Amino acid sequence: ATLKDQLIYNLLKEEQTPQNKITVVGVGAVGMACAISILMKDLADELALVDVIEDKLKGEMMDLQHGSLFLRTPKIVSGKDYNVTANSKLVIITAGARQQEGESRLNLVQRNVNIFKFIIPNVVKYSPNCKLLIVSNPVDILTYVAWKISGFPKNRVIGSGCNLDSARFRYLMGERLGVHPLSCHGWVLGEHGDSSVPVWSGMNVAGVSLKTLHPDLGTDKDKEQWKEVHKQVVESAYEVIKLKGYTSWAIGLSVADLAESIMKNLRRVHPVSTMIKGLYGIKDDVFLSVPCILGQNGISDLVKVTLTSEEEARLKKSADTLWGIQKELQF
Amino acid sequence: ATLKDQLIYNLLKEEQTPQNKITVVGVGAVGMACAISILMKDLADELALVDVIEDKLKGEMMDLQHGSLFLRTPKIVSGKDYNVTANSKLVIITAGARQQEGESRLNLVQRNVNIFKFIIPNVVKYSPNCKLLIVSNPVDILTYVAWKISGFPKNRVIGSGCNLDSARFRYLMGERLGVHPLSCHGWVLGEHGDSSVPVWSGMNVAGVSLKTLHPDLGTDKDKEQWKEVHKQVVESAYEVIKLKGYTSWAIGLSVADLAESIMKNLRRVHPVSTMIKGLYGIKDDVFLSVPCILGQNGISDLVKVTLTSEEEARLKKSADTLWGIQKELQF
Amino acid sequence: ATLKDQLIYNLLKEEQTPQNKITVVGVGAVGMACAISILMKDLADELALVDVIEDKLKGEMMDLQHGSLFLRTPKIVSGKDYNVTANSKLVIITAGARQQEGESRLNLVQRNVNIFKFIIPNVVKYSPNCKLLIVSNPVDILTYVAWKISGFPKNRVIGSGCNLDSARFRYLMGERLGVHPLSCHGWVLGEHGDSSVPVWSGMNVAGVSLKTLHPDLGTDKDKEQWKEVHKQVVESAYEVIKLKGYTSWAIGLSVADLAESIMKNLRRVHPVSTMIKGLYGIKDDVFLSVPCILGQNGISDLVKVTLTSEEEARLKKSADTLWGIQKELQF
Amino acid sequence: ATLKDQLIYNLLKEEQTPQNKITVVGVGAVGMACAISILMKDLADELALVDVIEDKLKGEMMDLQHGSLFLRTPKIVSGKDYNVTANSKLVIITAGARQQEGESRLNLVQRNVNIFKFIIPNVVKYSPNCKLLIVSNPVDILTYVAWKISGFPKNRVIGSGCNLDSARFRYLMGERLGVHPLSCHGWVLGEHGDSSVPVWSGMNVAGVSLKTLHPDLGTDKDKEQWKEVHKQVVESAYEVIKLKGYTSWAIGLSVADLAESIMKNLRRVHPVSTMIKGLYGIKDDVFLSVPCILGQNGISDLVKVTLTSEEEARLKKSADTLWGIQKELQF
């Protein structure tokens, strides 16, 4: 007899059906960052990667697999057939025409418009119940594309929106005050880009409202000039791409914090793109970031933040700008 | 006044003094993979990145800093100036030429010895009390070189060694036997290269020796062809490098593992690379990976792994090829 | 016009069903030590407690509940009626009339079968696809009982067995040798306690047999008295209980280790009790502890440990006494 | 010819100074819950236990030690001699004369001051540079006591205080809103106990002030009756004591978290007790809770919460009664 069977008495069969599968679509720098972080937070027991390049795909898979000793994720699978997606509770989409030196969240749409039409319909054919987390830019419109195509009630199609923008914000806030970002609370909402809006009313430490102590905080009259930390956040990715062509780690850490909420029913509040049709005016079927309540069904709840009239404005604007495009969708 | 002064009341002044600082030298794929693993296991309170590529170094530091929120390591620094290395408990060196497709690791010795002639002085100058962990290849030869240039006790100069080769061995073992690599045991000693030695003696699950249950284990007269699983771990690097152009994920977890045993002082046993003079009939200063005991002081104890005669010859000459290069080494 | 509706706008009318529920039956010391171990390892998104003394049951629930901020398990629930153990993937039994400051585990089986005939059917009534971790003492006969009552296939009625016994054996080894228990390997088997086999072979570090080194190990012939560590691994329950009046922390860490292997599908090996009918001279319907591949379907494979002369005796001697007791059981 | 010397060659002998040691004083329910939460977060390389009951100690130490296989804390030491507290970085005081189903957390201050006159001097002797955490109740007064008997500066004497008063307040805030305690923000400050202060303006989700939406909030005419959340918090302890006899689980999780911010230099914001003389109109040496900033030197910074002289009264009246008792302690 073979050595395996000389050493190991069998007892069953099936053992394949993964119970917490997670799938990354795209294995550029972002997808791998997502992957390496989903893998070290012990979120998924199966991890499936999909992309079109088949050398880069096999090799990345091989490399993580070689570390399984140092992990608690016991199956890692790759391939350009979406059949390995099969039964993923959550699917992360990062793939498509991404970025330049200089180009910003407004030089693709039509590129990525079309790529998506293969990816999405196949994520639904082997993961028909799954949850859809859109990362690749222009992320608010691509959540539109992802939603209609797959069908899916709006709660199960989440875009990653301003989740990282509020993080980079809470980092610059903490660096200014000497407090850990965990203890600085600040929200950045809207469409992820230059038309994000930092809601300064909610900026606080230990409960105390910074806007209250510093009434001119945010207005271009500000002594301390905080409106610029919101400009560091808009141009962080520009000044990190300028130093090394791309961003990766931070999105991966932010994304894995989102998957954490979903995969564990934390019902924490994150700012992510979902369908605000109704809220803040907005009568169109548009997507953009708002304090959501993420769980094993994704966006079950929204936190109806009270905006000022100029804030509610800049939202509707961007919320037009967008639908001025999506009425024109080839899909 | 200032906002930060309406809000926070200072009470203690002074201090940076790093209590558990780690320093990674080199921010290539390997480096940033260690830095990312080491950041996610909460091994450092300060983490420093040093390299010669200014903009890439800066940009990688920023990418990580933008993730502080999802981390628990409160300070991350970088620069060209080893001054930011100062007072480190552990210094992880990864800089230097890495293997092209097909290239051996010993073919990088001369190019890297030059780079160590620069790097080690500056490291010692700022953290003479540290432990040195060598990742760059050829890792056994560069561990030795780092010993001569540092003049650190042999126990504080550790080689990355065959910790990853044994870990790749245990992945392949486990996949043959449908077992998690944690529960498969078996050690790869020697050099981190083509003359590594697999030790079937100690191959076992649940304490059950595999060479007695199958007395043709390893050897060519092997119909199950187990000697090819050690051939797969030798050809591991080449094939990843073939596929994606470099390895990074597995070794960064392999390194953070070593780091875990040193920072927390576990006295775990790893096959790091150390000085073996006067053992297995070797009498010159050749560093080789034997199972060691790592902790707060680095290596402190060598497990004497009882080898065959072939296992002991394999090792001696994997050692004697190693000394060949090492003797003619000029610095 | 509530304030919650003024802040939250819902989308998800309905839903729940927990995807990683764990129930613990009995909130004595052991159970609550299980519960806290399970909780800080974030293995479950819903922890359910059930006992019959309800007051102590609700107080422990609140004590955990209040620590919600520090756990990643959003739903902790308990009660008297098992309708809240519903949808457990894993259920852990600590019930029964507990031993007292020094009672052996073979004077008790009578009353226990009859509580189990209330509990075990209620567990399946609400969580039909769950796995039965039996912790109650004595583990081997009581696992047989749980199995015989639920009608579950043997792969789903796991006994704590000699797991913590091997854990303690490994802690005693490493403290002898001066090594972390992780780098010391050893395997105690059989009926849990006294009739426990210390398989002196498996005793290895870095794979090199402690026996074939000093071949009077685990013998009366031993200068270094090593047959005694086994004796301490049997008299440990005693010496703790004799001092603090029950054992808790070590057992809950052990249960959380198996739980993790089951809930995270790790397929690691552990010395646990399941049916061993057909091996070593057992074709009774006994339960003993052997190395077992634990996965999402409980035991999946047995590790056919090659046992010696004297030891294969001790395994079945016990096994037929057990069968004595178990052939009479009135249920 | 020892089994050890044959299996291991030794390079270093000496050693010791553990880098992140933690001493817990008092192995009651609270102490042991502290010790177990600190062990399952890997904050310490060494944990010491000190107490008075010689046997009950060795049992708790030996139970944990048998769990060494499931922890990354290589050393656990117990003893009634505080020479085992040697070189701690954090020292957690849980010991004292506590209460029943009556005794108010304010009147016994003197019996405890007596006990602290034994502990504190021995603690500060063998760890002159430790951080001192007081959990024992009346935690605010006994913190002031520990401060005097040590001569330590303000920043290294810290009282447990309202840390769990706020954990519980936020957990209940999650009850009403269906949000994880992590995304519910609010502070309970003042004197630990019945006269703590719920800062209602603070209270927010996602940054939106619940006090601005629901202007009654925490008032008497408030139809949702948000006043009884505070009442629930203030009485929670005693209600849990009724049911199970004592509290434990939530404190240890409370203390683990504090211990992490200090041991990892987070600079996170916590409501711990510190010297408040000079703010809100207090001119006596009294400690009560405000949001301090916890680091590697303990308390480095205070948050000056905008109270409103009703709130600010409560604090004053708390200081005055506090200094009342503090003035009549013989020590």
Numbering used by the authors:
A (entry chain B), B (entry chain A), C (entry chain C), D (entry chain D): 1 to 331
Question: Would you copy out the relevant sentences from the publication that reported this structure?
Answer:
Lactate dehydrogenase (LDH) is a tetrameric enzyme composed of four subunits. The 1,4-dihydronicotinamide adenine dinucleotide (NADH)-dependent enzyme LDHA mediates a redox reaction for the reduction of pyruvate to lactate at the end of glycolysis when the cytosolic NADH/nicotinamide adenine dinucleotide (NAD+) ratio is high, which is a crucial step for regenerating NAD+, and is needed to maintain glycolysis for the survival of cancer cells. Full-length LDHA is composed of 331 amino acids and includes a nucleotide binding region (residues 28–56). In our structural study, the X-ray crystal structure of purified human LDHA showed a tetrameric complex consisting of 4 LDHA subunits (LDH-5).
We determined the human LDHA structure with malonate at a resolution of 2.9 Å, and malonate was derived from crystallization conditions. LDHA with malonate is a typical Rossmann-fold protein of mixed α/β secondary structures with a protruding N-terminal portion. This structure was solved in a new space group of monoclinic P21, and four malonate molecules were bound to each LDHA tetramer. According to our results, each monomer LDHA with malonate has one active catalytic substrate binding site. Two malonates are located in the active-site loop (residues 97–108) of the LDHA tetramer. LDHA with malonate in the substrate pocket has an active closed conformation. Oxygen atoms of malonate bind to the two charged residues (R105 and R168) and three polar amino acids (N137, H192, and T247) of LDHA. Interestingly, the structures of LDHA with malonate and NADH were shown with all active site loops in closed conformation, whereas when LDHA was associated with the inhibitor MA, the active site loops were in an open conformation.
